[PDB]
Amino acid sequence: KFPRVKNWELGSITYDTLCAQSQQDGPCTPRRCLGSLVLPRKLQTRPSPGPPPAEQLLSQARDFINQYYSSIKRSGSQAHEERLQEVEAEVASTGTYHLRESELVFGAKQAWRNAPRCVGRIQWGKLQVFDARDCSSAQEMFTYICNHIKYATNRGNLRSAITVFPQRAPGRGDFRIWNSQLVRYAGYRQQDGSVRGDPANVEITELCIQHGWTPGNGRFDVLPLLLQAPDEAPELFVLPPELVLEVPLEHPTLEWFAALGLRWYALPAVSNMLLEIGGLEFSAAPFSGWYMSTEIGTRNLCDPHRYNILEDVAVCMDLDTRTTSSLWKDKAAVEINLAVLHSFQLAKVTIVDHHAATVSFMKHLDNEQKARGGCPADWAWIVPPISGSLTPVFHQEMVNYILSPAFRYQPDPW
Amino acid sequence: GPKFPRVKNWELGSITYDTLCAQSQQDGPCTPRRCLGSLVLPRKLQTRPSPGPPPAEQLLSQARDFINQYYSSIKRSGSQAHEERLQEVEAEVASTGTYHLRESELVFGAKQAWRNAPRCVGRIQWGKLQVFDARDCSSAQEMFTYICNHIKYATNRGNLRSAITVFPQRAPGRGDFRIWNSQLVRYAGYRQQDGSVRGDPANVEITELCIQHGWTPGNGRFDVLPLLLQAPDEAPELFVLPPELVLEVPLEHPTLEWFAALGLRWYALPAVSNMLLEIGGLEFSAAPFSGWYMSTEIGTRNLCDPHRYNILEDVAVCMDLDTRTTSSLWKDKAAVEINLAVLHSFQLAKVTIVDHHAATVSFMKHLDNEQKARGGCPADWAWIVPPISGSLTPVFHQEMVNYILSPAFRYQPDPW
Ligand code: HEM
Ligand code: HEM
Ligand SMILES: C[C@H](O)[C@H](O)[C@H]1CNc2nc(N)[nH]c(=O)c2N1
Ligand SMILES: C[C@H](O)[C@H](O)[C@H]1CNc2nc(N)[nH]c(=O)c2N1
Ligand SMILES: [Zn+2]
C-alpha cells in the first residue's frame, strides 16, 4: 500500500504515505518503468480553447482552497467556508475562478515544494512572489521580467523569485515566454552544421533572428526575449546588459584556464514551464533561484551536445586523450567544476556545489518526512551528473509521484 | 504514433520504440500513481521460498513459454520437434510435478537470463558465456570442487572469461542447494569493540556466520572469507579457498608514489553467488556467475562508499587537499585518482578490467543491436549510469525502459 523507503548508507527506513495524495498519473505501469524518460505526453498540458469540465475544476479548486486554509491553521473557519462558496459561485457562472494574492503566494511555494526534480527544495519556504496577473501586453511582461531579474540578481546575492502572468483562459491565446530561460546564449548554425555558441539554443536563436533580431557571432551572445501576449505575434525585447550579470571563468591554480574565455550567467531562471494551482494554469510564470555548480560546470559546458569543452581543457592540461582508461575526461570535468565554483565565489555570486546541495536535500527529505509523510523525488535528476555515489542522495531510495500545486511541462508556443 | 514507449537519446536526438516490453510477463514495482524505479529491492521479483510444489498450471505456462523461446532461438518454431518437446514437458510435469531441461536449453536460458538482466552494463558480451552444467552435484564437497573449477577457468590467470556454474534446481519439498556467501570472493568484516569495522563492512554478517560455523577468523583488512556451501536438507559446510586460486591485485597509482604504501588491493574475479536463476519456471537457487570488473565497481563503490572501505578522506589527506570544505571537491579529486589506480594496477597485473567509459560505450552498441534483434532492451538507468562522471558517459543521455523478462536472475532470501 505504502512504499518502504531505505537509505543504504545508513540503514534507516521510512514509509511514504504522502504518495497516497497523488491524484495525477505518471508514465509508469506495473509492466514497465519509464522513470528515466524526460518528457511525457499524457502529463503534458493540452490546449485551452474550451472551458475545463466544471466538475473537474471545482474539485481541484476545493482541494487547493482546503490546502490553503490548513496552511494558516484556519481550516473549517468562517473564511474557509465563505471562500469555497465564492469559488463555487464563480466557477458555476463563469466556468472558472480567480485566486487571491495570498493563495497565489501559497500555491507558488507549494509547486516548488512538490517539484520532484528540484534538489534545492530546502529553500522552498523563502520565495519572493511577484503578482503580474495585471499584465495586458508583451511590453508589460518585459517590464515585470526586468524587475524580477533586478531583484533576483541583487548584485550577486541571488534571491529566489517567481513572476506570475495571467492564467490561461478558454478560447484565448496564452501569455508565453518563448525562451526556455530568461538568459540564453545564442546558438548559430555555421559552416558544416557545426554550432557556434550554445547548441541547445539553436532553434530559439533562429526564431529571434526571424523576428528582426540582429545576430552576433560569439560563443556567449545573450539572446533577446520573445514575449507573447494572447493571440499576438511574439515581440522582441533586448535585455539591458547591466541587468544580465555574468561571471568570467578562471581556475584557482591553472593560469591558462582564464584564456579559454569561458563565462556563464549568474541567474538560472526557467521560463517555459507551466504553473498549475487549484486547476488554474499559468502558462508564463518564470522562476529563479541560484545555480548548483554542476549545472554549468558539468552539463552546460561539458555535455557533448552543449559547449562540449572537455577535450580542450584536457589538451590544455596535457592529458592523454588517446584512451578512455587515462580518465582524461573525468579529470578535466573536475577542474571545470572547480573553476566554476572558484570564479563564482570570486565574483561574489551565489552558487552551491553538489556536495553541499545534496546534503541540504537530505535534511529536506527528513523535514518533509515529519511534515508530510514523504517527499516526491526523481532519483535520476537529484543525483549530480558527476561524482554520483560520492553524494548522500545516491544511496537514498526515492518515491516519485505527482502532487499539485505543480510545475509541469507544456508545448512550445510555435 | 506507435503504441509503445517512445525512447529518446538526448545527445543524438534519435528516437526508438520499445516493443519488447510487450513480452514482459511479470509486473514490476511501479504504478501510474508512483514510480519506485530507484528502490534496490522493492517486493517484486523477490523469489521468496515457496516450499510446497508450485501450481502445475502456473509452471506449465512458464515452461511452454520458455520452450517456445528456445525453439524460436534455433528457428524451429512450430516444428514437430517443438511440439513433441512441448508434449514431453507437459507429460513430465503431469506425472512428477516438475520437469527437466535438455543441455542446450540450459545454455540458452543461462545466456538469455544474462541478456535480460536490467542492471548489467556488460551485456554486449551476453553471447559469450561458458556454461558449466553441475546439475549432477550431490554434496557440499562436490559443490566446492565445481566452484574451484569455475574460479580456475574464469580467472584464467588474468585473462578472465565469463562463466556460470548451474547446480541442481529446486525440487518438490526438498532442501535447496545454496551458497551462503553473496560472492565467491568476499573480504571479512570484523566488528570492533568500539563498534567500528575492520575490513569490508558489507560482509560483517557472513563473517560472523562463518565464525559461528567453525572458521578461525583473522584480523586483516583483506582476509578472504571461506565459503558456506549448503546441499539439500543439510547444514552448511565450511570450505577454505586455496590461496593460489584467488587472484588479487595490489593497488598502486601511476604517478602518486605513496598510493602503494596504502596497502590497498582487490580480487580479480567478480562472482555473484546468491542470486536465483529462473528458466521456464524451474529455479536454480545456486548458480554462481562471473564476468570481469568495471573499474568503478572497485574504485568508486567498494573503496569509496561511506559504508564500505570509505578511503576517500585518507586519500585526500595524502593528496593534501582541503577536506574541510565541500567546494574544494576533494572527494571528487580523490575519487578520480583512486579509480585511476584501479585501472592502472589491473592493467599492470595483466588482469582483465574495463573502465566506465569503454563499458558504457559498448552498452550503447549493445542497445543498438538489441533494438534490431528484439525491438528493445530492458535497462535500469540508476544502475547502468556509472557512480562517477555520470553525464560524461553516453548512457546518461539515453532514456531507458525497465521491465522483467524471463529467463532471469532474481534476488532470493538469505538461507539463514
Ligand atoms: C534556491 C536555489 C535553487 C537551486 C540551487 C535549485 C537547483 C535545481 C537543480 C540542480 C535543478 C535541475 C536543473 C537541470 O538539470 O536542468 C532544478 C530543477 C528544478 N527546480 Fe530548483 N533549484 C532552486 C530554486 C528553485 C525555485 C525558486 C523553483 C521554483 C519556484 C525551483 C523549481 C524547480 C523545478 C520545477 C525544477 C525542474 C525544472 C525542469 O524540469 O527543467 N527551483 N533546481
Ligand atoms: C563480462 C563482464 C561483465 C561486466 C563488465 C559486467 C558489469 C556489471 C556491473 C557494473 C554490474 C553492477 C555491479 C554492482 O553495482 O553491484 C553488473 C550487474 C549484473 N550483471 Fe554484469 N557484467 C559482466 C558479466 C556478467 C555475467 C557473465 C553475468 C551473468 C551470466 C552478469 C549478470 C549480471 C546481473 C544479474 C547483474 C545484477 C546483479 C545485482 O543485482 O547485484 N554480468 N554487471
Ligand atoms: C535520459 C535521462 O533521463 C536524462 O539524461 C536526465 C537524467 N538526469 C538529469 N538530471 C538533471 N538534474 N537534469 C537533467 O537534465 C537530467 N537529464
Ligand atoms: C538507492 C539507489 O537505488 C542505489 O544506491 C543504487 C543506485 N545505482 C546503483 N548502480 C549500480 N551499478 N550498483 C548499485 O549498487 C547501485 N545502487
Ligand atoms: Zn517507474
UniProtKB/Swiss-Prot annotation, chain B:
UniProt binding sites for Zn(2+): 30, 35
Modified residues (Phosphoserine): 50
Annotated localization: Cell membrane; Membrane, Caveola; Cytoplasm, Cytoskeleton; Golgi apparatus
Record: residues binding (6R)-L-erythro-5,6,7,8-tetrahydrobiopterin: 38, 382-383, 396
Post-translational modification: Phosphorylation of Ser-50 by CDK5 reduces activity.
Binding site for heme b: 120, 411
Positions contributing to L-arginine binding: 183, 292-293, 297, 302
Segments for region (Interaction with NOSIP): 34-416
Coiled coil: none
Assembly and binders: Homodimer. Interacts with NOSIP and NOSTRIN. Interacts with HSP90AB1. Forms a complex with ASL, ASS1 and SLC7A1; the complex regulates cell-autonomous L-arginine synthesis and citrulline recycling while channeling extracellular L-arginine to nitric oxide synthesis pathway.
Homology family: Belongs to the NOS family.
Known role: Produces nitric oxide (NO) which is implicated in vascular smooth muscle relaxation through a cGMP-mediated signal transduction pathway. NO mediates vascular endothelial growth factor (VEGF)-induced angiogenesis in coronary vessels and promotes blood clotting through the activation of platelets.
Annotated protein name in UniProt: Nitric oxide synthase 3
Organism in which the protein naturally occurs: Bos taurus
Positions spanned in the full protein: 67 to 482 of 1205
